[PDB]
């Protein structure tokens, strides 16, 4: 599955990966800058903590950057 990955926000082919994911979460700058954004790939949709939002999809290059 080919997914967008950071910091390059470019498409990359992930062996053994089945899902693209966009993971957003606040750091110390969430109030000034915005919610940290991480683009990646995984074999299963990652389990996240409470304040961390995640969006998983199965298409190729389906985790672009908002």
């Amino acid at each position, epitope marked *: 599955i080919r997914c967008f990955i*950071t*910091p390059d926000i470019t498409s990359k082919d992930c062996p053994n990966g089945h899902v693209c994911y966009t993971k957003t979460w606040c*750091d110390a*700058f969430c109030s000034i800058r915005g919610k940290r*954004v*991480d683009l990646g790939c995984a074999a299963t949709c990652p389990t996240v903590k409470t304040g961390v939002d995640i969006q998983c999809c199965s298409t190729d290059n389906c985790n672009p950057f908002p």
Partner: nanobody
Amino acid sequence: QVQLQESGGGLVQPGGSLRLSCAASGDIGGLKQMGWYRQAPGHQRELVAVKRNENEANYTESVKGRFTISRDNARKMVYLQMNSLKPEDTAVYYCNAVVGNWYTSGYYEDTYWGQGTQVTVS
């Protein structure tokens, strides 16, 4: 969030050699650049060496051929080999690291600094 911790400084005679190491830990996701600067009494934090990912190392022409910067990215560390030390090289050396990260509003770079380690030559 980001900790730079240094080590390797000390006292040496003219012509001796040292090896400083700076370890980065924490939210080093997107670590993008790392450098060693010096500061002696009365000086500013002056450039000694720097290495930006996917760029060639840059040195100050006062240390070319004598110092050597290197980055181990699996360990997330930067090291400075200081050969043929001379008295003018005496100062507190700091390691800075520039980390780059994406937010909903865009990609920002931030500079974090190290505790600083003494290097004396006499």
